Amino acid sequence: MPLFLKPDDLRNYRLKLKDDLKRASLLPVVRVCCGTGCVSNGSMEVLSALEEALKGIGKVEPVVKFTGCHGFCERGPIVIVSPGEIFYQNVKTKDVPEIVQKTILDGEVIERLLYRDPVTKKTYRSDHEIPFYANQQRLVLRRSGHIDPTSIEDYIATDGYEALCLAFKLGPDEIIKQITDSYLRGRGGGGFRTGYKWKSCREVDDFPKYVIANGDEGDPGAFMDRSLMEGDPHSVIEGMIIGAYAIGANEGYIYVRNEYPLAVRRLQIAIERAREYGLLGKNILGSGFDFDIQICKGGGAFVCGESSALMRSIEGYPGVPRVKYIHATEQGLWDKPTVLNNVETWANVPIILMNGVEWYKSLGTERNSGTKIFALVGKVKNTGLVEVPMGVTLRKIIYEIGGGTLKDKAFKAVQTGGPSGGCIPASLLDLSVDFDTLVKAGSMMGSGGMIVMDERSCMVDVAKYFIDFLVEESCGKCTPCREGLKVLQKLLHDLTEGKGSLQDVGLLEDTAHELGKTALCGLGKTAANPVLSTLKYFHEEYEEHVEGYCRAGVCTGLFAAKIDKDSCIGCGQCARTCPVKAISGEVRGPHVVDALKCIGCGQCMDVCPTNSIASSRRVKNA
């Protein structure tokens, strides 16, 4: 292990690594996406198969390694062969010998394994020309999908820990001055300025001090923080060293979940690589600043992401939020000064100090600089990690990047921020996605996960789902979140079952408004945002659900299907799907559904290829 006593040693070792990379540019490196989305999709098998297949090729076998999330999670297992810098999608074990023999050996690019645009009918050889990728600015995730997250050599050769060398020359005052002037606002959804947090932690003279990385990702449907911690933990470690040298902290903690074995193991491996190399421990790079990182791994709890609850969970207590009027930068972990930023906020610090403040502010809008990582999921054609500059319109993320809704159903809403945010209808698709603009609309940037709803998503059911999640994730400390959430769940279960009334809707809005202004922590205060957003923008659905009709066809028994007699192709998949066999149609011809015979369950509507069946109002007359 090379222990860099001096910054000159780090610079020279990086020079040697770059020199070897230059000589190894001709080597056919194969990198396999081993992030959570593709490991679950069966990419480890492809990794092992490629490792076995490359054995016995020439005197020097082609290199094979694993990487983090490449970004296009909808593509499944992704292997990137460096000999031609070729993007391969949906790679299976059957395709391993063919990939080796044709691409790695014969140089033949497999046409059927390349990405094809479903819109323009074009095949893309490389990842940079993919429309999903072409409309992104991958700045924080620049190394993810191209390096081995466990190999600090890849990180160093890619200008890693060099911003730490710059920070050691700048000094603690200049680092904090450059952070504030970069307008780096916290990427954990709050949007608070990172520079103010670091400065207000340096001002207080109570020692010791700590820096924390909130690797908890409590938002359901969001994985950008986990994918960052798995793609490159060293961009988090370096951030935690810069932010500690700036504020004088000597200890560092990364708070993650035990439910993330990949992230935990890769973060621990990265730390073990850092302490070997002298970047963590004692007398780092001959600067007299000793700093060491640990990893507190908790269980799965939404509230534990909250700062005050995160401190308690680290200390060895249940992660129950506590009401405090003194910020965590003055009395945080063990009542000591503590800087808590999420892993994406920490990862921007090396970018800020490496590429400069002026370059960092050149991105995004005014007061909202840099980039943001979005976990675009839901009903979108394209699902994965989307990183875009601030100020990008939601229409871009959902249509140019996302490709639109699944199949071709009409776009209805986009839930931003998760259970702590609100839905935005199709009318407001030209809003900038920076911090302030989404707040103005009543939604919230929040975690970053964007959920796309189409015509088959009932907004009453969406609000009920979010309320159920917040009921099961409430810590139960304070009366509003403990009980008013149960009241909202009762009201929303009445509406989805046809047992509602207009007075129920009015009481729902009143209860949401009173819950927002009376809860203790951020879970309860923002718990009413989905309900309030659905009420504000989709009140017609609430009125129809009061009348007993669900226009989205989600709430069971509140609708009757209607088969089109023009666009129906007579495939009969709906007939084979109906549990009560209430579908009677011409063989290889238009079909007909009996309103009285149908009960309404939605099984048929999701399998029609023509999308010719939708909800119709029930006949209560007979």
Binding site: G476, C478, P480, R482, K517, T518
Partner: protein, 247 residues
Amino acid sequence: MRDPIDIVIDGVSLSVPMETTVLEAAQMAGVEIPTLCHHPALPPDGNCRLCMVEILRPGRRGELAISCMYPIRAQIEVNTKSDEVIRARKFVLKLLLNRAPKSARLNALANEYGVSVESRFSFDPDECVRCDRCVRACETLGPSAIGPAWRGFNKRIVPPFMEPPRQCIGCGACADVCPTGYIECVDEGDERTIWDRKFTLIRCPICGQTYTTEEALKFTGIEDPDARLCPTCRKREYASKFRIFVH
């Protein structure tokens, strides 16, 4: 000592010291604010969210804050009988009353605020408002026997592992600090049953009276045999040692 700050509560001007809660300012100014979870002897938690007041700042709108914990560090105007305050108190009172309908305290508060029990929104009424008063009293006493054991609407204050507490003392302070009377401490003869555990009481040798358990007296570490006497009997026994000289 810092310079006191002048604040106005419902049109009443008063100079309160630094780092003083709004509830203390209302108490010294004669203003009444309803509270459920706050206990002056226990570390405050801010659970019930029932002591809501409006804080109006120069150039800023009124916002709801809990008077039992919100400190007075700047020049603010506090309003306790505002419409928004009344709505928030009605909401919290409805929730608490539906949780504990048989409670006298919550029913009195509802009668004060015109709140009635609703049958539709009464899920599992078990007479516990989760104010954490008993847990904090137990913690401050020294034996940390009881504690919360779930999250969400299923949160409950239980002995550890749902068994007769192995660190309980029998003092009965947890039952004393309880707004809804959910905890029961029954004494029959020389037995005290609290948290479904039986504690043996102490009888003074000349009175037959009881004021504490054997476990409590062993916990306090008072080895004087007079500690087993009841206060009246002990006082009489000590007073007998005074040989008054009538001459």
